[PDB]
Design an enzyme around this catalytic site. Sequence first.
Site, PDB file in Angstrom:
ATOM      1  N   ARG B 543       0.828  -1.215   0.000  1.00 54.65           N
ATOM      2  CA  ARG B 543       0.000   0.000   0.000  1.00 54.65           C
ATOM      3  C   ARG B 543       0.868   1.274   0.000  1.00 54.65           C
ATOM      4  NH1 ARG B 543      -5.782  -0.398   0.964  1.00 54.65           N
ATOM      5  NH2 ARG B 543      -5.552   1.890   1.003  1.00 54.65           N
ATOM      6  N   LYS B 548       6.230   3.935   4.422  1.00 53.96           N
ATOM      7  CA  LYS B 548       6.816   2.859   3.621  1.00 53.96           C
ATOM      8  C   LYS B 548       7.873   3.390   2.640  1.00 53.96           C
ATOM      9  CE  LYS B 548       2.599  -0.032   3.983  1.00 53.96           C
ATOM     10  NZ  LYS B 548       3.126  -1.405   4.343  1.00 53.96           N
ATOM     11  N   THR B 650       4.793  -8.651   5.705  1.00 57.09           N
ATOM     12  CA  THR B 650       4.637 -10.047   5.274  1.00 57.09           C
ATOM     13  C   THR B 650       4.996 -10.191   3.795  1.00 57.09           C
ATOM     14  OG1 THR B 650       2.277  -9.708   4.877  1.00 57.09           O
ATOM     15  CG2 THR B 650       2.883 -10.746   6.984  1.00 57.09           C
ATOM     16  N   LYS B 654       7.173 -13.211   1.563  1.00 56.71           N
ATOM     17  CA  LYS B 654       6.790 -13.783   0.260  1.00 56.71           C
ATOM     18  C   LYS B 654       7.949 -13.715  -0.744  1.00 56.71           C
ATOM     19  CE  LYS B 654       2.223 -11.752   1.150  1.00 56.71           C
ATOM     20  NZ  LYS B 654       1.214 -10.746   0.645  1.00 56.71           N
TER      21      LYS B 654
HETATM   22  O1  LIG Z   1      -4.212  -0.733   9.620  1.00 59.79           O
HETATM   23  C1  LIG Z   1      -3.280  -1.525   9.489  1.00 59.79           C
HETATM   24  C2  LIG Z   1      -2.324  -1.678  10.505  1.00 59.79           C
HETATM   25  C3  LIG Z   1      -1.273  -2.577  10.310  1.00 59.79           C
HETATM   26  N1  LIG Z   1      -1.190  -3.327   9.113  1.00 59.79           N
HETATM   27  C4  LIG Z   1      -0.100  -4.297   8.863  1.00 59.79           C
HETATM   28  O2  LIG Z   1      -0.410  -5.529   9.540  1.00 59.79           O
HETATM   29  C5  LIG Z   1       0.452  -6.568   9.030  1.00 59.79           C
HETATM   30  C6  LIG Z   1      -0.046  -7.876   9.665  1.00 59.79           C
HETATM   31  O3  LIG Z   1       0.366  -7.897  11.041  1.00 59.79           O
HETATM   32  C7  LIG Z   1       1.943  -6.262   9.351  1.00 59.79           C
HETATM   33  O4  LIG Z   1       2.781  -7.196   8.675  1.00 59.79           O
HETATM   34  C8  LIG Z   1       2.368  -4.837   8.945  1.00 59.79           C
HETATM   35  F1  LIG Z   1       3.568  -4.497   9.542  1.00 59.79           F
HETATM   36  C9  LIG Z   1       1.288  -3.804   9.316  1.00 59.79           C
HETATM   37  O5  LIG Z   1       1.572  -2.527   8.725  1.00 59.79           O
HETATM   38  C10 LIG Z   1      -2.159  -3.183   8.115  1.00 59.79           C
HETATM   39  O6  LIG Z   1      -2.081  -3.841   7.076  1.00 59.79           O
HETATM   40  N2  LIG Z   1      -3.204  -2.274   8.306  1.00 59.79           N
END
Ligand SMILES: O=c1ccn([C@@H]2O[C@H](CO)[C@@H](O)[C@H](F)[C@H]2O)c(=O)[nH]1
Lengths: 810, 810
Positions: B543, B548, B650, B654
Amino acid sequence: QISVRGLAGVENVTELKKNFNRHLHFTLVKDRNVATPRDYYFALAHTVRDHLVGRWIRTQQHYYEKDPKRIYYLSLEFYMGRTLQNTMVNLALENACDEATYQLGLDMEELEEIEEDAGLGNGGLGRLAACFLDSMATLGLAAYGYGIRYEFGIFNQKICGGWQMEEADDWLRYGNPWEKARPEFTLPVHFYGRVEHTSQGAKWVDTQVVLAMPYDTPVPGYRNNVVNTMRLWSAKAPNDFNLGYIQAVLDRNLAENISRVLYPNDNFFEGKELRLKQEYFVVAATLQDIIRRFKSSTNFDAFPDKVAIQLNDTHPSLAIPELMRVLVDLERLDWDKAWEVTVKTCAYTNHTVLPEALERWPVHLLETLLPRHLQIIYEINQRFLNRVAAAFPGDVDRLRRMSLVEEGAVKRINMAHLCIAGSHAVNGVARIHSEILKKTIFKDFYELEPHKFQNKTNGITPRRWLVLCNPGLAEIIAERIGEEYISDLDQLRKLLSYVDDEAFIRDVAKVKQENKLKFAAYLEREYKVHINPNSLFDVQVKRIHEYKRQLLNCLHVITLYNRIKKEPNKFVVPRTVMIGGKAAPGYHMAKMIIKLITAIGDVVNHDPVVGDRLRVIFLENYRVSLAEKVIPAADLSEQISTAGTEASGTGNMKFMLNGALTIGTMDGANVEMAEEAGEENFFIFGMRVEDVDRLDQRGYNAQEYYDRIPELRQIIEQLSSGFFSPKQPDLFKDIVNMLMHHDRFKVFADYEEYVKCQERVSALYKNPREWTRMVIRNIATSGKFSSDRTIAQYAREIWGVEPSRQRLPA
Amino acid sequence: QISVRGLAGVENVTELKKNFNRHLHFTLVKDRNVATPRDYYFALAHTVRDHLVGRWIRTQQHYYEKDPKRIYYLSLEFYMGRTLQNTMVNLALENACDEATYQLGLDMEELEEIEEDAGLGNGGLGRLAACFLDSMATLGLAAYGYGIRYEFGIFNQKICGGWQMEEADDWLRYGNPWEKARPEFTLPVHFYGRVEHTSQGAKWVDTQVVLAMPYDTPVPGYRNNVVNTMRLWSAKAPNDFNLGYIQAVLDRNLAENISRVLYPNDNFFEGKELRLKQEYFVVAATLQDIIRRFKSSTNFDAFPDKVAIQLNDTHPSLAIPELMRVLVDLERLDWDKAWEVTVKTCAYTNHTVLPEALERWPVHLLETLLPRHLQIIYEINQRFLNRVAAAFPGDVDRLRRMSLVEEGAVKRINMAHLCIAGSHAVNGVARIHSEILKKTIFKDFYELEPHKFQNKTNGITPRRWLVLCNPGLAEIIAERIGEEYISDLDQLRKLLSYVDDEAFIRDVAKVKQENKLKFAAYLEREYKVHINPNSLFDVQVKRIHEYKRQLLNCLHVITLYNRIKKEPNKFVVPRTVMIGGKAAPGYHMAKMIIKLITAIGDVVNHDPVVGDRLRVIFLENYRVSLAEKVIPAADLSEQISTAGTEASGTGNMKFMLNGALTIGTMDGANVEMAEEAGEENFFIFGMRVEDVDRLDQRGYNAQEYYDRIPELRQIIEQLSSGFFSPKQPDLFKDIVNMLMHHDRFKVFADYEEYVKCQERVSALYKNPREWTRMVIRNIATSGKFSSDRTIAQYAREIWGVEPSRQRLPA
Ligand SMILES: O=c1ccn([C@@H]2O[C@H](CO)[C@@H](O)[C@H](F)[C@H]2O)c(=O)[nH]1
Ligand SMILES: O=c1ccn([C@@H]2O[C@H](CO)[C@@H](O)[C@H](F)[C@H]2O)c(=O)[nH]1
């Protein structure tokens, strides 16, 4: 069990049981441990549907190969009811499914009650479309029903404190196993925008787009392996629609609301924008589909040779200027050529003469929503009026009367006038109605183009309205004359030979008693209401309207009650009077009539002096499935509209077929029913059309009747004083005021003759044998009223196609 | 064709072909003459679904009989992607279906591309839920995923004139063959109303009711015959809803809007009422279902022995006071007992430390929508703060810091604080993140209850993210070490034995080249974009967000371009730089970053001096299905968040599994990946968390870097002057201003180290053999990052259940 329900062969039963179990497992994802009766219904529905598929695919392939002329029946209403039993009947699977389910430990009739009605209509007009589809498939016509897939059909009616309450008819909640979505054949429909004139013709630009997605439902013919299609359109927003972000997605509802709900008005025009959108939506999507199918079989000269479009009332009248729009603006045909094609393609059926039912759309609505169509309508009007002026020179009044544009405070378009101008055939729906059209409301048009005007007396399908709902009667008939009458109802005439047959007399009467017992038990089970099965079942079921005169029935009921109270110890033939039907949510008087009926029951049903000699029941939530239950149980059919107001009626025909006698006015198809059976075998009373006209000429004065009829005076005094509403003495003041000062339908004028005729009914009912002989004379002459006869006449006299009873290969 | 795809036995292939033809005929109502590739996809999907059914029914029956402790994973997001190939993989049907379809004259891979993604999530958090469901089924846990069936998932992204445009994701248009509607298990959910206090406790009255209708989707485990359930709730209005008439029916939309659309924010809290309704809707329906299932197996002491509830972030945090409400108000448990049960049942996973992502709901919203829940939250707060005061007497600041109620202009409820108070376990998602929680944002809570705080490093499923998306790599691995690694990823360590194996080195490199060729061909076919397959594929997909640092990547790309323009005739390792990802519709800076990337491509891709030495591509509509295509093709994985901001990541995992090397900061799981593989085998650069803290303490001054780095100065001057936007010279002024004056993420501070690290990457890429050996060292040590490892840790350390690799009978 009974012969007309077909064979239960070992191979078939074994196969059905196998496929039932397969669907329960794979389709429903259930096992017998957790399955409910609803799961079992769905497993059965899917099993029966499988049998339709092969025939459906090969029928449509057959039409592609043979390329016959296609018939398109356009309607805003298809009042289909339930599909499971009808499908079994037409495929000869009823006994086999009954056996298969019995061996699985299930009662099929219990499973049948789970299915929701497809209540996509209001009453007569919508149910006619449904009977027509059945007959067209049975007669092997390449026919397609086109309409709207309403998410919510006609509302479910609940009675609370004696008043009608409305609940949404969420008929799709559990799914619809019969339909097949066809998202691949989605078509765009345009709204709003503006007209641009270029070097080469008009262009309709800057429009809003709504998608029309079709859902197809199979329509099986009676044991001929024909399966036709009903295609219903559902509204979808385009994906870039309104495209802050969240609201734009939520606003997709605005587009999709077009197919959300059926307008619940019957014989009443409500000029709302959303209704106009529905009418154009069905017409625009359907015509694209028609043209696509035609091209896939350049030259539009042959269009009327390959296509017929039937307009069910004026609701799809926009087909006329839409066809012109496509031919002129898109295909680039000259006006005159396009008009010739349009007229030869389109035909129009009128269903009522009541002025409040006629569609007259404000020009300002059409101007905003459909600017190009308004322009086309103006041009049609100009050319039509030039023809009138040439035929009747100097007759300036005729020009204003015949105009498609109605002048006044707000200018309106008369959609009936548009339909007559743009159709090669215009029909009424019973002989008296078709005559009234030529003499009154369409007289000017008849004088210009006499050849256009026809009659097509309505009918009902003997599959749903005899074999399905009354197997007992179907069986005793088949025992004597065989099974051919089911697709050739005129054969019922052979039954006149049995009018003095003591065995047959006994069997006819036995079937009626069993039907009455079954319905009496249904009422206690589902509604906790106690009725005497030995009483005369006196039934008026139809939509609630002033013209249908449920109020006249009410006056008779109170008369009976008052006579009993005056002489408690005198014998009277016991009656159960049942009245049912829905009122349109905004129709105040109709809602008051429902309250009056329950209020009469509240008094009558609890008077110990009356006992079980008189009961008054309001039948809640009248709909197709309920009609199938109450009609076979009826002794007396009430068809009591003011002469000249009910165009045909079709409920009348259902009762005649099922062994009820008729009390009625000389109105609509009642005239032809009496003619077929013989007037001695009908209970005819009241003013004829000519008598109503005479009364109008000198002026109707209700006070005269009140003054001269003491029994009528008593009832009005009871209503006014609060006899039927002790807590709210003035509850019925609106009803009394209307009856006394503002009654368009002359309730008092027919009261005396009605009561006297009802006495003659009671007299005959005291003689069971002679009652039943008269019943046999009615059943035996009901053949003309098969919708197979009606459709054969449309086919030969309007559409230019020949019906066929020949089987397609299985 | 390849071994890991299973057997194609004659019996199986024959059976599949038979059932394919059956579904095409009976289910789809088509014949081969008129069928399209979409029809063929659906016939295949239904055929594969049939194989799931028996196992699904018997798994659920098994849980009923054995009554194990049940695990409930509550999430507002399940980012599932496509289901067809995944199902074939887990059932060992891939080769058989491939053969069957080939014999029917169809290409299975072509049919697979027709399926829509189930895009019911935003990014990492939603995709984690999806991997978790796969692992829980593979480890034989009695687990249920509960969420919302959004009608519209994450928007489809189109790029128009270099800008992001949003289109509705109408993923259900053609139907969803995988789900089964269960309207029979519909449950009511209450909103608004008021609280009444009686002799016996509180009562929540005068509520508005919305129905929750479940749809179940099967979740197959890897070749163990386990099929678990994901149950997603859909909002329906009650039938008496608003029940002038037409408007009341149309207004049903208001209730049904709850499940209409996924909020498209990632790592950003938007406090909108509709979102709060969604959060309560899922919690209320789910908890009723949980309690129902528990009672069907009086005494709530055993509730935590039979039930675990996992909260995926704070989105379903209302589970805590809802459970209390039910236990206290409805089941009549005393407060203390109810609280004990609640704490032992619930556990909470935190996914971010960014302050703008934390859910802090205005009290006035909760007061109106959920008045009883607000009361319960206040009582929880009072009792919790009494414990804090007892443990840290006189520490008044600590009391304000730890309160669930945040004081200020508008009072808010801190949902993270509520979750910590009401859960027996709180976890972060990578070691560094879990440590940061204890040291910073949740320090006070850690001091009160140290035992609650745990780490569970994230993982990804090796089924979807290796076997499915990269069969070529899966096959060459299986050739050497067998197939057991697919459900035991730690076995990949055995590959360290092949690091000097010349055959294996050649095969690893061959698989990557083939993947790159396939993706290069995909881009030209579907998007008409030309890329050089011999170049280094440099990929950042995730995203779009400031933290990032896609912007840091942009700075490197411009640096490369400027260096080429300065010395055109010097050799440079050719690169294809690919960046993809969606921006939340309201996130202005993220939308500007997308425009910058396309604007750089517009210049770079058309400079004849550059040739094919550098290409910059924006990958449109990044989603699960696209990830499965681009990840196996990547050489270099960009994981360049500012240290301390990406909780885990994650996508990083991958890429490691699929043979890309990683350039990254010591952030999130990057730290553990480098530790597993060895720092020599990773390209680590930039500030550590401690360095960021030091810079914050003295104050970040971006001007210092601009002043001291001439190459950086040039780029900022190019951006400011209009070099990348000739027609709109000031287009990127917002970006420059942010970088220079308001950069929370210190882009300039890591620029010099980043560029130098990128030079080291290019140096290694010039030596194919040593590049590939380093790749083997990464793949071989990726085992820790299987979501099977992650779930086993949740099972043993939080849920109190034992995983099982044992097969259920087929
Ligand atoms: O609103 C959010 C908050 C955190 N996240 C993500 O969750 C993933 C699963 O734990 C992590 O790998 C990432 F580090 C984190 O940014 C999102 O994807 N939406
Ligand atoms: O709005 C209307 C107008 C007329 N009709 C009915 O159509 C039936 C079918 O022709 C006729 O049998 C009835 F006479 C007529 O009242 C309706 O049911 N809704």
